[PDB]
Amino acid sequence: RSYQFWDTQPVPKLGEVVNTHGPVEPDKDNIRQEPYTLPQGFTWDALDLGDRGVLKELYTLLNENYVEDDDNMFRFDYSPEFLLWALRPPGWLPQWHCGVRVVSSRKLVGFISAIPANIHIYDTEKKMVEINFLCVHKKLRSKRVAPVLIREITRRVHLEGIFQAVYTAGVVLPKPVGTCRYWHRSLNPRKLIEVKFSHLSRNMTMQRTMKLYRLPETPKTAGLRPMETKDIPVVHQLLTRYLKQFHLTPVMSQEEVEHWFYPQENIIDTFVVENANGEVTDFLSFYTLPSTIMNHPTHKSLKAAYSFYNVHTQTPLLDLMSDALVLAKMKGFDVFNALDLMENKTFLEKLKFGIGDGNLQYYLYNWKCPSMGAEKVGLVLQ
Ligand SMILES: CCCCCCCCCCCCCC(=O)SCCNC(=O)CCNC(=O)[C@H](O)C(C)(C)COP(=O)(O)OP(=O)(O)OC[C@H]1O[C@@H](n2cnc3c(N)ncnc32)[C@H](O)[C@@H]1OP(=O)(O)O
Ligand SMILES: Cc1nn(C)c(C)c1CCOc1c(F)cccc1-c1ccc2c(c1)c(CN(C)C)nn2C
Ligand SMILES: [Mg+2]
């Protein structure tokens, strides 16, 4: 409708037909040197996530105050080591871990982050940032703190000479460049139904539901194994080639591919397929992100795996994704989550995913381009 903060920003208007490609406003040769002012009694604090205490403050802020589902029944519970993986990739900067503290008690009440990313958007590649983990404490909601955090990260990114950003959100803002539905594949239906993430079809009993969701105990594809250090270059080569077919994608160096894919227990899993010749031809990956089951007496945490990047050249994608489900089930996950981006629509129904109840919107800051279908979005943010 109208957007008091967003209408002031270099982004297209909702329902502006965009034909051109490029920035919304010219690049700045003078940047504001003073931080934006917070309301009385609050202060900025850049968070040193290498200090275990401070990282545990951020873990607690997000565990108590970050994204919930539409029913206010589940809340993300990013672990401390996951936060390090997501917030310290190659090129991370300390001033881009932007905290807000109560001056008197020092309590952490706000956060926003930027990390650097090279982004391929249609026929342009540009150095941008990815914005994530914007959070204001429940007690501070609806006081227009969020646009101060957004302006302040913007200023800190401008100081580094960067004028574009990419970000996702559940809410509709001016103006999505793509819209993706999330979908969910049940791995432990009795639990999912007990905690009311899922319901039992009116037309299926529990016994039938367990059989419907049952998977084999070991993956089908020959030569599947975890990614090792020797696979970093071929994973990088495969992913670079595979991404060319999408219109919004990252461009990762070999060091960024090692950061984002080399396995870390309970954070990131990557498995490659190594054929009879010793060549790696395919890989699957998914990250670990549990959700707190709010106010529930029994089950406290929902264990969820999320589809990350899956590259196929010799193994059909259908089988690579069946493999990912099997591996997730083996590792104790309750549910396997995926978006309808890249070629995912080719497998979601076939593999018994059910559609969820919302959208994840994709956005660029200060770049106008035409919007794209979900199938052409080739970028996954944590
Ligand atoms: C060149 C560099 C550029 C870098 C910057 C690029 C842009 C980055 C943008 C950030 C990308 C974030 C990526 C992620 O992390 S998405 C994850 C966002 N986090 C959560 O959903 C956690 C739970 N919720 C919260 O912590 C608060 O509800 C948040 C902080 C989300 C809003 O706090 P609060 O509810 O207390 O609101 P307010 O009164 O202070 O502010 C109201 C204003 O804020 C606009 N709003 C509300 N939600 C969002 C949102 N998710 N993206 C952008 N704008 C949002 C809203 O339309 C209104 O603007 P307008 O309608 O008046 O215009
Ligand atoms: C389980 C569960 N626990 N909670 C607390 C929720 C919301 C679910 C639903 C999770 O739905 C997704 C999925 F199935 C696959 C891929 C992405 C998602 C998703 C959706 C909305 C999302 C995100 C990520 C992110 C994280 N980041 C910015 C991408 N922010 N918001 C607003
Ligand atoms: Mg607020």
Side-chain angles (χ1 to χ4, degrees), residues 27-33 46 90-97 113-118 126-131 151-165:
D27 280 11
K28 284 180 191 310
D29 27 59
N30 297 74
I31 309 300
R32 179 177 229 280
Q33 296 191 95
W92 68 274
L93 296 177
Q95 55 266 47
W96 286 355
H97 295 163
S113 69
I115 60 173
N118 272 166
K126 227 183 183 203
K127 195 83 258 191
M128 296 194 186
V129 297
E130 298 180 1
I131 306 301
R151 285 188 304 271
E152 179 59 16
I153 201 62
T154 294
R155 195 183 67 79
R156 292 183 193 193
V157 171
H158 283 171
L159 288 171
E160 302 291 325
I162 291 174
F163 293 97
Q164 279 85 27

mmCIF file of all heavy atoms in Angstrom, residues 27-33 46 90-97 113-118 126-131 151-165:
data_model
loop_
_atom_site.group_PDB
_atom_site.id
_atom_site.type_symbol
_atom_site.label_atom_id
_atom_site.label_comp_id
_atom_site.label_asym_id
_atom_site.label_seq_id
_atom_site.Cartn_x
_atom_site.Cartn_y
_atom_site.Cartn_z
ATOM 1 N N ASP A 27 25.881 6.082 -7.504
ATOM 2 C CA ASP A 27 26.835 5.766 -6.464
ATOM 3 C C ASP A 27 27.305 7.062 -5.720
ATOM 4 O O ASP A 27 27.424 8.098 -6.308
ATOM 5 C CB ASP A 27 28.064 5.029 -6.948
ATOM 6 C CG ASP A 27 27.845 3.563 -7.160
ATOM 7 O OD1 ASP A 27 26.677 3.184 -7.131
ATOM 8 O OD2 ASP A 27 28.810 2.875 -7.494
ATOM 9 N N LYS A 28 27.680 6.918 -4.451
ATOM 10 C CA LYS A 28 27.885 8.092 -3.604
ATOM 11 C C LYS A 28 29.351 8.427 -3.438
ATOM 12 O O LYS A 28 30.168 7.583 -2.995
ATOM 13 C CB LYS A 28 27.264 7.757 -2.217
ATOM 14 C CG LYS A 28 25.761 7.827 -2.201
ATOM 15 C CD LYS A 28 25.179 7.480 -0.803
ATOM 16 C CE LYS A 28 23.696 7.296 -0.931
ATOM 17 N NZ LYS A 28 23.008 8.402 -1.653
ATOM 18 N N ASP A 29 29.717 9.693 -3.702
ATOM 19 C CA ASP A 29 31.147 9.964 -3.445
ATOM 20 C C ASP A 29 31.406 10.593 -2.067
ATOM 21 O O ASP A 29 32.585 10.826 -1.677
ATOM 22 C CB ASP A 29 31.751 10.741 -4.610
ATOM 23 C CG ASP A 29 30.729 11.545 -5.319
ATOM 24 O OD1 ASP A 29 30.131 12.398 -4.616
ATOM 25 O OD2 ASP A 29 30.497 11.302 -6.549
ATOM 26 N N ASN A 30 30.336 10.827 -1.309
ATOM 27 C CA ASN A 30 30.440 11.281 0.086
ATOM 28 C C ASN A 30 29.460 10.421 0.858
ATOM 29 O O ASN A 30 28.278 10.323 0.450
ATOM 30 C CB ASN A 30 30.020 12.771 0.266
ATOM 31 C CG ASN A 30 30.908 13.714 -0.481
ATOM 32 O OD1 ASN A 30 30.835 13.811 -1.704
ATOM 33 N ND2 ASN A 30 31.760 14.382 0.230
ATOM 34 N N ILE A 31 29.962 9.817 1.899
ATOM 35 C CA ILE A 31 29.109 8.978 2.757
ATOM 36 C C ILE A 31 29.087 9.633 4.119
ATOM 37 O O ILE A 31 30.130 9.907 4.764
ATOM 38 C CB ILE A 31 29.645 7.513 2.851
ATOM 39 C CG1 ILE A 31 29.937 6.883 1.487
ATOM 40 C CG2 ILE A 31 28.706 6.672 3.768
ATOM 41 C CD1 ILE A 31 28.684 6.843 0.695
ATOM 42 N N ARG A 32 27.876 9.641 4.698
ATOM 43 C CA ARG A 32 27.641 10.033 6.122
ATOM 44 C C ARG A 32 28.582 9.326 7.110
ATOM 45 O O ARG A 32 28.628 8.039 7.161
ATOM 46 C CB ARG A 32 26.181 9.694 6.518
ATOM 47 C CG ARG A 32 25.708 9.986 7.942
ATOM 48 C CD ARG A 32 24.220 9.593 7.935
ATOM 49 N NE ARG A 32 23.342 10.619 8.512
ATOM 50 C CZ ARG A 32 23.159 10.800 9.827
ATOM 51 N NH1 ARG A 32 23.883 10.113 10.691
ATOM 52 N NH2 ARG A 32 22.307 11.723 10.292
ATOM 53 N N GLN A 33 29.319 10.098 7.906
ATOM 54 C CA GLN A 33 30.346 9.531 8.799
ATOM 55 C C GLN A 33 29.824 9.127 10.200
ATOM 56 O O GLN A 33 30.434 8.297 10.911
ATOM 57 C CB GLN A 33 31.521 10.509 9.014
ATOM 58 C CG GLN A 33 32.258 10.771 7.712
ATOM 59 C CD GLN A 33 33.522 11.501 8.100
ATOM 60 O OE1 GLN A 33 34.586 10.861 8.273
ATOM 61 N NE2 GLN A 33 33.384 12.794 8.400
ATOM 62 N N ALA A 46 29.337 -3.133 17.955
ATOM 63 C CA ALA A 46 29.708 -4.135 16.979
ATOM 64 C C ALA A 46 30.049 -5.420 17.717
ATOM 65 O O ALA A 46 30.716 -5.366 18.717
ATOM 66 C CB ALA A 46 30.909 -3.627 16.133
ATOM 67 N N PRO A 90 34.470 -15.947 4.013
ATOM 68 C CA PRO A 90 35.629 -15.173 3.518
ATOM 69 C C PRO A 90 35.250 -13.703 3.252
ATOM 70 O O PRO A 90 34.226 -13.407 2.623
ATOM 71 C CB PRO A 90 36.055 -15.950 2.290
ATOM 72 C CG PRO A 90 35.697 -17.360 2.599
ATOM 73 C CD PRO A 90 34.331 -17.220 3.294
ATOM 74 N N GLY A 91 36.003 -12.782 3.825
ATOM 75 C CA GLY A 91 35.777 -11.355 3.572
ATOM 76 C C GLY A 91 34.851 -10.701 4.566
ATOM 77 O O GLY A 91 34.544 -9.454 4.448
ATOM 78 N N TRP A 92 34.418 -11.453 5.621
ATOM 79 C CA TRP A 92 33.561 -10.857 6.640
ATOM 80 C C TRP A 92 34.252 -9.669 7.279
ATOM 81 O O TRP A 92 35.479 -9.682 7.445
ATOM 82 C CB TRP A 92 33.121 -11.892 7.724
ATOM 83 C CG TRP A 92 34.237 -12.344 8.555
ATOM 84 C CD1 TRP A 92 35.115 -13.373 8.291
ATOM 85 C CD2 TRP A 92 34.654 -11.749 9.796
ATOM 86 N NE1 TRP A 92 36.008 -13.443 9.294
ATOM 87 C CE2 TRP A 92 35.815 -12.438 10.193
ATOM 88 C CE3 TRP A 92 34.204 -10.661 10.548
ATOM 89 C CZ2 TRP A 92 36.508 -12.160 11.400
ATOM 90 C CZ3 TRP A 92 34.888 -10.330 11.736
ATOM 91 C CH2 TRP A 92 36.058 -11.045 12.143
ATOM 92 N N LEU A 93 33.463 -8.674 7.669
ATOM 93 C CA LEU A 93 34.041 -7.485 8.332
ATOM 94 C C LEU A 93 33.393 -7.311 9.713
ATOM 95 O O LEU A 93 32.199 -7.439 9.817
ATOM 96 C CB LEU A 93 33.760 -6.211 7.504
ATOM 97 C CG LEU A 93 34.465 -6.259 6.107
ATOM 98 C CD1 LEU A 93 34.048 -4.972 5.351
ATOM 99 C CD2 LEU A 93 35.987 -6.396 6.048
ATOM 100 N N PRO A 94 34.128 -6.896 10.725
ATOM 101 C CA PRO A 94 33.576 -6.724 12.075
ATOM 102 C C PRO A 94 32.533 -5.679 12.194
ATOM 103 O O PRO A 94 31.573 -5.863 12.963
ATOM 104 C CB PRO A 94 34.792 -6.341 12.918
ATOM 105 C CG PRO A 94 35.809 -5.829 11.917
ATOM 106 C CD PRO A 94 35.598 -6.588 10.661
ATOM 107 N N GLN A 95 32.616 -4.578 11.439
ATOM 108 C CA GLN A 95 31.627 -3.484 11.565
ATOM 109 C C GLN A 95 30.337 -3.903 10.920
ATOM 110 O O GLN A 95 29.342 -3.202 11.078
ATOM 111 C CB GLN A 95 32.131 -2.159 10.828
ATOM 112 C CG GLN A 95 32.484 -2.384 9.359
ATOM 113 C CD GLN A 95 33.957 -2.697 9.012
ATOM 114 O OE1 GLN A 95 34.648 -3.537 9.637
ATOM 115 N NE2 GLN A 95 34.468 -1.944 7.961
ATOM 116 N N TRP A 96 30.304 -5.069 10.258
ATOM 117 C CA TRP A 96 29.068 -5.521 9.573
ATOM 118 C C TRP A 96 28.274 -6.531 10.517
ATOM 119 O O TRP A 96 27.306 -7.115 10.065
ATOM 120 C CB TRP A 96 29.383 -6.149 8.238
ATOM 121 C CG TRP A 96 29.761 -5.125 7.175
ATOM 122 C CD1 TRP A 96 29.743 -3.753 7.270
ATOM 123 C CD2 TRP A 96 30.169 -5.440 5.856
ATOM 124 N NE1 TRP A 96 30.173 -3.180 6.079
ATOM 125 C CE2 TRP A 96 30.433 -4.205 5.198
ATOM 126 C CE3 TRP A 96 30.366 -6.642 5.170
ATOM 127 C CZ2 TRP A 96 30.835 -4.140 3.836
ATOM 128 C CZ3 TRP A 96 30.851 -6.599 3.828
ATOM 129 C CH2 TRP A 96 31.085 -5.326 3.179
ATOM 130 N N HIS A 97 28.737 -6.718 11.757
ATOM 131 C CA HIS A 97 27.983 -7.532 12.781
ATOM 132 C C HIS A 97 27.458 -6.456 13.727
ATOM 133 O O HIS A 97 28.116 -6.114 14.707
ATOM 134 C CB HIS A 97 28.939 -8.562 13.425
ATOM 135 C CG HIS A 97 29.429 -9.592 12.423
ATOM 136 N ND1 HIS A 97 30.525 -10.385 12.643
ATOM 137 C CD2 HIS A 97 28.991 -9.889 11.181
ATOM 138 C CE1 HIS A 97 30.675 -11.206 11.628
ATOM 139 N NE2 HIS A 97 29.765 -10.928 10.711
ATOM 140 N N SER A 113 23.085 -7.978 10.086
ATOM 141 C CA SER A 113 24.448 -8.308 9.571
ATOM 142 C C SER A 113 24.516 -8.091 8.055
ATOM 143 O O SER A 113 23.494 -8.222 7.330
ATOM 144 C CB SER A 113 24.801 -9.767 9.932
ATOM 145 O OG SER A 113 23.984 -10.664 9.172
ATOM 146 N N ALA A 114 25.730 -7.881 7.541
ATOM 147 C CA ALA A 114 26.032 -7.958 6.137
ATOM 148 C C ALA A 114 27.235 -8.903 6.006
ATOM 149 O O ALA A 114 28.167 -8.832 6.831
ATOM 150 C CB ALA A 114 26.443 -6.583 5.626
ATOM 151 N N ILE A 115 27.202 -9.700 4.961
ATOM 152 C CA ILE A 115 28.428 -10.390 4.523
ATOM 153 C C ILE A 115 28.645 -10.121 3.036
ATOM 154 O O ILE A 115 27.689 -9.861 2.268
ATOM 155 C CB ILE A 115 28.334 -11.917 4.794
ATOM 156 C CG1 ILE A 115 27.116 -12.510 4.006
ATOM 157 C CG2 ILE A 115 28.381 -12.229 6.332
ATOM 158 C CD1 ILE A 115 27.072 -14.059 4.103
ATOM 159 N N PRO A 116 29.916 -10.143 2.588
ATOM 160 C CA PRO A 116 30.169 -9.819 1.163
ATOM 161 C C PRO A 116 29.780 -10.980 0.271
ATOM 162 O O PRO A 116 29.870 -12.156 0.698
ATOM 163 C CB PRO A 116 31.688 -9.634 1.161
ATOM 164 C CG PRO A 116 32.248 -10.442 2.278
ATOM 165 C CD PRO A 116 31.158 -10.317 3.386
ATOM 166 N N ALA A 117 29.245 -10.672 -0.907
ATOM 167 C CA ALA A 117 28.920 -11.749 -1.892
ATOM 168 C C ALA A 117 29.047 -11.179 -3.248
ATOM 169 O O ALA A 117 28.454 -10.120 -3.505
ATOM 170 C CB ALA A 117 27.553 -12.311 -1.747
ATOM 171 N N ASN A 118 29.714 -11.885 -4.138
ATOM 172 C CA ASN A 118 29.624 -11.575 -5.564
ATOM 173 C C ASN A 118 28.350 -12.197 -6.103
ATOM 174 O O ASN A 118 28.099 -13.410 -5.860
ATOM 175 C CB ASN A 118 30.780 -12.220 -6.317
ATOM 176 C CG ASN A 118 32.018 -11.358 -6.364
ATOM 177 O OD1 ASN A 118 33.081 -11.872 -6.701
ATOM 178 N ND2 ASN A 118 31.901 -10.027 -6.041
ATOM 179 N N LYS A 126 28.270 -8.369 -9.853
ATOM 180 C CA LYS A 126 28.697 -7.300 -9.002
ATOM 181 C C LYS A 126 28.981 -7.706 -7.567
ATOM 182 O O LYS A 126 28.319 -8.601 -7.008
ATOM 183 C CB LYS A 126 27.634 -6.182 -9.018
ATOM 184 C CG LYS A 126 28.324 -4.850 -9.212
ATOM 185 C CD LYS A 126 27.366 -3.677 -9.173
ATOM 186 C CE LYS A 126 28.155 -2.410 -9.448
ATOM 187 N NZ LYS A 126 27.386 -1.279 -8.874
ATOM 188 N N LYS A 127 29.944 -7.027 -6.957
ATOM 189 C CA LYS A 127 30.218 -7.185 -5.546
ATOM 190 C C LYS A 127 29.059 -6.513 -4.782
ATOM 191 O O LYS A 127 28.779 -5.318 -4.963
ATOM 192 C CB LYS A 127 31.581 -6.571 -5.220
ATOM 193 C CG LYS A 127 32.199 -6.953 -3.865
ATOM 194 C CD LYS A 127 32.953 -8.290 -3.878
ATOM 195 C CE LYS A 127 32.128 -9.397 -3.254
ATOM 196 N NZ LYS A 127 32.930 -10.636 -3.022
ATOM 197 N N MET A 128 28.342 -7.285 -3.956
ATOM 198 C CA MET A 128 27.235 -6.795 -3.176
ATOM 199 C C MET A 128 27.487 -7.323 -1.750
ATOM 200 O O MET A 128 28.564 -7.865 -1.453
ATOM 201 C CB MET A 128 25.937 -7.459 -3.677
ATOM 202 C CG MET A 128 25.579 -7.099 -5.100
ATOM 203 S SD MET A 128 23.890 -7.558 -5.459
ATOM 204 C CE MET A 128 23.834 -7.187 -7.182
ATOM 205 N N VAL A 129 26.533 -7.078 -0.865
ATOM 206 C CA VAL A 129 26.404 -7.750 0.409
ATOM 207 C C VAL A 129 25.116 -8.553 0.468
ATOM 208 O O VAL A 129 24.135 -8.198 -0.253
ATOM 209 C CB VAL A 129 26.556 -6.832 1.648
ATOM 210 C CG1 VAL A 129 27.967 -6.229 1.676
ATOM 211 C CG2 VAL A 129 25.494 -5.732 1.646
ATOM 212 N N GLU A 130 25.105 -9.580 1.324
ATOM 213 C CA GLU A 130 23.830 -10.268 1.657
ATOM 214 C C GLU A 130 23.460 -9.814 3.059
ATOM 215 O O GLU A 130 24.296 -9.856 3.960
ATOM 216 C CB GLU A 130 24.066 -11.766 1.684
ATOM 217 C CG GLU A 130 24.488 -12.240 0.335
ATOM 218 C CD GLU A 130 24.750 -13.723 0.281
ATOM 219 O OE1 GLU A 130 24.591 -14.425 1.316
ATOM 220 O OE2 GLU A 130 24.962 -14.155 -0.881
ATOM 221 N N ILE A 131 22.263 -9.345 3.238
ATOM 222 C CA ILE A 131 21.781 -8.899 4.558
ATOM 223 C C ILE A 131 20.931 -9.997 5.180
ATOM 224 O O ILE A 131 20.101 -10.596 4.490
ATOM 225 C CB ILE A 131 20.953 -7.566 4.447
ATOM 226 C CG1 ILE A 131 21.754 -6.428 3.694
ATOM 227 C CG2 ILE A 131 20.436 -7.154 5.836
ATOM 228 C CD1 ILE A 131 23.080 -6.104 4.410
ATOM 229 N N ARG A 151 19.204 1.412 7.851
ATOM 230 C CA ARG A 151 20.007 2.545 7.422
ATOM 231 C C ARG A 151 21.417 2.467 7.922
ATOM 232 O O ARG A 151 22.322 2.838 7.191
ATOM 233 C CB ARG A 151 19.394 3.870 7.892
ATOM 234 C CG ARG A 151 18.201 4.210 7.071
ATOM 235 C CD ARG A 151 17.678 5.647 7.400
ATOM 236 N NE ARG A 151 17.357 5.900 8.837
ATOM 237 C CZ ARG A 151 16.145 5.655 9.393
ATOM 238 N NH1 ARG A 151 15.137 5.187 8.646
ATOM 239 N NH2 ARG A 151 15.912 5.952 10.655
ATOM 240 N N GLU A 152 21.605 2.010 9.145
ATOM 241 C CA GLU A 152 22.942 1.971 9.647
ATOM 242 C C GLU A 152 23.784 0.892 8.894
ATOM 243 O O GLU A 152 24.991 1.087 8.631
ATOM 244 C CB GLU A 152 22.899 1.751 11.124
ATOM 245 C CG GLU A 152 24.251 1.654 11.836
ATOM 246 C CD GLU A 152 25.122 2.922 11.657
ATOM 247 O OE1 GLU A 152 24.660 4.001 11.263
ATOM 248 O OE2 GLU A 152 26.308 2.848 12.010
ATOM 249 N N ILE A 153 23.269 -0.310 8.669
ATOM 250 C CA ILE A 153 24.088 -1.267 7.927
ATOM 251 C C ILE A 153 24.344 -0.683 6.516
ATOM 252 O O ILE A 153 25.365 -0.975 5.973
ATOM 253 C CB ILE A 153 23.435 -2.700 7.914
ATOM 254 C CG1 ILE A 153 24.491 -3.775 7.613
ATOM 255 C CG2 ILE A 153 22.283 -2.833 6.994
ATOM 256 C CD1 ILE A 153 25.615 -3.898 8.607
ATOM 257 N N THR A 154 23.333 -0.038 5.920
ATOM 258 C CA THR A 154 23.534 0.521 4.608
ATOM 259 C C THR A 154 24.707 1.468 4.603
ATOM 260 O O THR A 154 25.563 1.386 3.717
ATOM 261 C CB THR A 154 22.274 1.257 4.182
ATOM 262 O OG1 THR A 154 21.193 0.340 4.008
ATOM 263 C CG2 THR A 154 22.494 1.810 2.789
ATOM 264 N N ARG A 155 24.720 2.405 5.533
ATOM 265 C CA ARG A 155 25.863 3.381 5.694
ATOM 266 C C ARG A 155 27.196 2.634 5.851
ATOM 267 O O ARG A 155 28.199 2.961 5.186
ATOM 268 C CB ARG A 155 25.614 4.168 6.975
ATOM 269 C CG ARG A 155 26.456 5.444 7.131
ATOM 270 C CD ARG A 155 26.179 6.111 8.485
ATOM 271 N NE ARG A 155 26.665 5.298 9.598
ATOM 272 C CZ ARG A 155 27.919 5.244 9.962
ATOM 273 N NH1 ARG A 155 28.855 5.993 9.283
ATOM 274 N NH2 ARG A 155 28.288 4.500 10.979
ATOM 275 N N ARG A 156 27.241 1.603 6.720
ATOM 276 C CA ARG A 156 28.526 0.887 6.961
ATOM 277 C C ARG A 156 28.963 0.141 5.701
ATOM 278 O O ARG A 156 30.181 -0.075 5.504
ATOM 279 C CB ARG A 156 28.367 -0.060 8.127
ATOM 280 C CG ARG A 156 28.189 0.711 9.422
ATOM 281 C CD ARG A 156 28.097 -0.258 10.568
ATOM 282 N NE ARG A 156 27.631 0.381 11.794
ATOM 283 C CZ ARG A 156 27.674 -0.133 13.011
ATOM 284 N NH1 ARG A 156 28.114 -1.370 13.267
ATOM 285 N NH2 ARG A 156 27.196 0.566 13.996
ATOM 286 N N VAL A 157 27.976 -0.295 4.869
ATOM 287 C CA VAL A 157 28.337 -0.977 3.615
ATOM 288 C C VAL A 157 28.793 0.043 2.592
ATOM 289 O O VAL A 157 29.780 -0.203 1.835
ATOM 290 C CB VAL A 157 27.149 -1.842 3.113
ATOM 291 C CG1 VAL A 157 27.435 -2.378 1.705
ATOM 292 C CG2 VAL A 157 26.974 -3.026 4.122
ATOM 293 N N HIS A 158 28.094 1.179 2.569
ATOM 294 C CA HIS A 158 28.563 2.299 1.627
ATOM 295 C C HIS A 158 29.959 2.695 1.919
ATOM 296 O O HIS A 158 30.756 3.007 0.964
ATOM 297 C CB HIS A 158 27.640 3.480 1.809
ATOM 298 C CG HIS A 158 26.292 3.327 1.134
ATOM 299 N ND1 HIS A 158 25.241 4.222 1.327
ATOM 300 C CD2 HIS A 158 25.849 2.419 0.239
ATOM 301 C CE1 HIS A 158 24.221 3.881 0.557
ATOM 302 N NE2 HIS A 158 24.564 2.793 -0.112
ATOM 303 N N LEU A 159 30.376 2.699 3.177
ATOM 304 C CA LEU A 159 31.747 3.116 3.526
ATOM 305 C C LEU A 159 32.802 2.200 2.891
ATOM 306 O O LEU A 159 33.946 2.628 2.697
ATOM 307 C CB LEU A 159 31.957 3.097 5.015
ATOM 308 C CG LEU A 159 31.206 4.240 5.736
ATOM 309 C CD1 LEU A 159 31.274 4.041 7.238
ATOM 310 C CD2 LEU A 159 31.823 5.594 5.380
ATOM 311 N N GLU A 160 32.432 0.978 2.621
ATOM 312 C CA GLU A 160 33.289 0.022 1.924
ATOM 313 C C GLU A 160 33.143 0.052 0.396
ATOM 314 O O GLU A 160 33.721 -0.782 -0.299
ATOM 315 C CB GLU A 160 32.980 -1.365 2.478
ATOM 316 C CG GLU A 160 33.177 -1.455 3.944
ATOM 317 C CD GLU A 160 34.607 -1.376 4.349
ATOM 318 O OE1 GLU A 160 35.513 -1.889 3.601
ATOM 319 O OE2 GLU A 160 34.781 -0.794 5.457
ATOM 320 N N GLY A 161 32.359 0.930 -0.146
ATOM 321 C CA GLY A 161 32.330 1.166 -1.573
ATOM 322 C C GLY A 161 31.334 0.243 -2.244
ATOM 323 O O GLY A 161 31.379 0.038 -3.432
ATOM 324 N N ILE A 162 30.421 -0.328 -1.469
ATOM 325 C CA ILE A 162 29.451 -1.258 -2.047
ATOM 326 C C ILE A 162 28.063 -0.614 -2.041
ATOM 327 O O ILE A 162 27.659 -0.054 -0.969
ATOM 328 C CB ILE A 162 29.448 -2.583 -1.219
ATOM 329 C CG1 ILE A 162 30.754 -3.301 -1.442
ATOM 330 C CG2 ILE A 162 28.261 -3.484 -1.696
ATOM 331 C CD1 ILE A 162 30.954 -4.559 -0.580
ATOM 332 N N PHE A 163 27.303 -0.712 -3.150
ATOM 333 C CA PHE A 163 26.072 0.026 -3.298
ATOM 334 C C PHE A 163 24.873 -0.793 -3.619
ATOM 335 O O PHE A 163 23.744 -0.283 -3.800
ATOM 336 C CB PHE A 163 26.338 1.179 -4.333
ATOM 337 C CG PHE A 163 27.313 2.214 -3.786
ATOM 338 C CD1 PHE A 163 28.658 2.170 -4.103
ATOM 339 C CD2 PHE A 163 26.830 3.161 -2.911
ATOM 340 C CE1 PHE A 163 29.563 3.101 -3.542
ATOM 341 C CE2 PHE A 163 27.727 4.083 -2.332
ATOM 342 C CZ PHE A 163 29.071 4.043 -2.661
ATOM 343 N N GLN A 164 25.101 -2.135 -3.718
ATOM 344 C CA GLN A 164 23.994 -3.080 -3.893
ATOM 345 C C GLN A 164 23.963 -4.159 -2.804
ATOM 346 O O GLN A 164 25.021 -4.492 -2.241
ATOM 347 C CB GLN A 164 24.053 -3.703 -5.281
ATOM 348 C CG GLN A 164 23.455 -2.787 -6.353
ATOM 349 C CD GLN A 164 24.466 -1.762 -6.885
ATOM 350 O OE1 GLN A 164 25.703 -1.970 -6.881
ATOM 351 N NE2 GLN A 164 23.945 -0.600 -7.258
ATOM 352 N N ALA A 165 22.775 -4.731 -2.590
ATOM 353 C CA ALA A 165 22.665 -5.819 -1.591
ATOM 354 C C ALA A 165 21.571 -6.726 -2.094
ATOM 355 O O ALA A 165 20.712 -6.347 -2.940
ATOM 356 C CB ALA A 165 22.287 -5.341 -0.186
#
